[PDB]
Design a protein around this ligand. Structure first.
Ligand SMILES: Nc1ncnc2c1ncn2[C@H]1C[C@H](O)[C@@H](COP(=O)(O)O)O1
Ligand SMILES: [Mn+2]
Ligand SMILES: [Mn+2]
Ligand SMILES: [Mn+2]
Ligand SMILES: [Mn+2]
Ligand SMILES: [Mn+2]
Ligand SMILES: [Mn+2]
Ligand code: NA
Length: 346
DNA sequence: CGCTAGTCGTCAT
DNA sequence: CGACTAGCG
């Protein structure tokens, strides 16, 4: 997620109701609902007791969408992306702590604080996701497990014209080049929409409303794939790309201190990591549900060698990718946990 | 002052 | 995933 991006481009946002997309197709970033839903039953999840409350939670949203003639496609995160591994480890660490300190507090009588710890330690498993998937399919709703981050899969579905809008809490989706994004959507259908075309409604951006420069700015502010330089956020990054008159981004980043009148030490690795992050936003693997095969989010340019792009996701055989996308294949064990055949979105 | 970095909350009785 | 804020320059 781009820290503070939603406030930074807030003038491009427009309150809406989802009936706006009646009779159209909308893809969902389902881990947002999953997380919110799992919080409601955190005690039982932390204690290992059985629960399916989070299923009902997600399902009231899905049913709400259906009541307004919306075709939802639930998308799920798949295998872990190397580019993101660090950030993920950090989350795990925090969760681990909040589990121990939680249990600790249960052995000190204090349950009020223990629950506040349990709510911050929930880990969303693939089994839980799959429960949501079965529940959804029982209502005729398509589900799709992304090969890697759902962000990219969603962006792809949007850019391909497969869906008209993405529902998510996550600002990243704009850096991936989503067309339309629906944030803050509640159980009634009220949300905030940001169109890519309307980023020019943000005077604060200047000419940084093109897809490329916007992406550069997001990376420079600090993202999941690369931490910012010391003291650089959206404002500074944006400013740098505004004053930037050179087309080559590397030389810009080498003169970033000059553009901001600061003494910024830029490590040589920061460049390669920037290239890495850029390439990850551009080329992260996704699954074409129509051709049923793995593809990068955008076609490889002449300036990128795909062999160097392992951090953006490893290729696997299309048949495996398909079984993962169907939610048939367990991400961890790669064993078959279900037998859904749609032949008897795809 | 604007801005970044780090801490706290998402559920729901 | 984000919102909020104390404190940084
Ligand atoms: N605490 C919390 N609240 C809301 N959304 C969250 C949270 N942690 C992660 N996420 C989002 C980030 C990803 O888009 C997705 C999977 O993250 P993963 O870490 O694999 O579960 O869920
Ligand atoms: Mn609760
Ligand atoms: Mn895989
Ligand atoms: Mn995500
Ligand atoms: Mn993201
Ligand atoms: Mn070219
Ligand atoms: Mn202040
Ligand atoms: Na930053």
């Amino acid at each position: 997620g781009i820290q503070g991006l939603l406030q930074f481009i807030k003038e491009a946002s427009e309150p809406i109701h989802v009936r706006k997309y009646k009779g159209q197709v909308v893809a969902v970033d389902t881990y947002c609902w999953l997380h919110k839903g799992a919080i409601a039953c955190a005690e039982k999840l932390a204690k290992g007791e059985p629960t399916d409350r989070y299923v009902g939670f997600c399902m009231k949203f899905v049913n709400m969408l259906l009541s307004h003639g919306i075709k939802p496609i639930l998308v799920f995160d798949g295998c872990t992306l190397p580019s993101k591994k660090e950030v993920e480890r950090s989350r795990r660490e925090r969760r681990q702590a909040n589990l121990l300190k939680g249990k600790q507090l249960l052995r000190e009588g204090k349950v009020s604080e223990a629950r506040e710890c349990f709510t911050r330690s929930i880990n969303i498993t693939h089994a839980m996701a799959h429960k949501v998937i079965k529940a959804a399919r029982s209502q005729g709703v398509d589900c799709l497990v992304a090969p890697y981050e759902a962000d990219a899969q969603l962006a792809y579905l949007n850019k391909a014209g497969i869906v008209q809008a993405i529902i998510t809490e996550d600002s990243d989706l704009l850096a991936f080049g989503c067309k339309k994004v629906i944030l803050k959507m509640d159980q009634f259908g009220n949300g905030l929409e940001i169109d890519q075309a309307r980023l020019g409604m943000c005077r604060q951006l200047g000419d940084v409303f093109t897809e490329e420069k916007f992406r550069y700015m997001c990376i420079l502010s600090g993202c999941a794939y690369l931490s910012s330089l010391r003291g650089i956020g959206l404002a500074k990054a944006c400013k740098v790309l505004r004053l930037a008159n050179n087309p080559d981004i590397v030389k810009v980043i080498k003169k970033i201190g000059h553009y901001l009148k600061m003494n910024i030490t830029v490590p040589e690795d920061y460049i390669n990591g920037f290239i890495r992050a850029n390439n990850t936003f551009l080329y992260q693997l996704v699954f074409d549900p129509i051709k049923r095969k793995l593809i990068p989010l955008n076609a490889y340019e002449d300036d990128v060698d795909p062999e160097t792009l392992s951090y953006a996701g490893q290729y696997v055989d299309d048949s495996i990718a398909l079984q993962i996308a169907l939610g048939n294949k367990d991400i961890n064990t790669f064993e078959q946990i279900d037998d859904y055949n749609p032949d008897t979105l795809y």
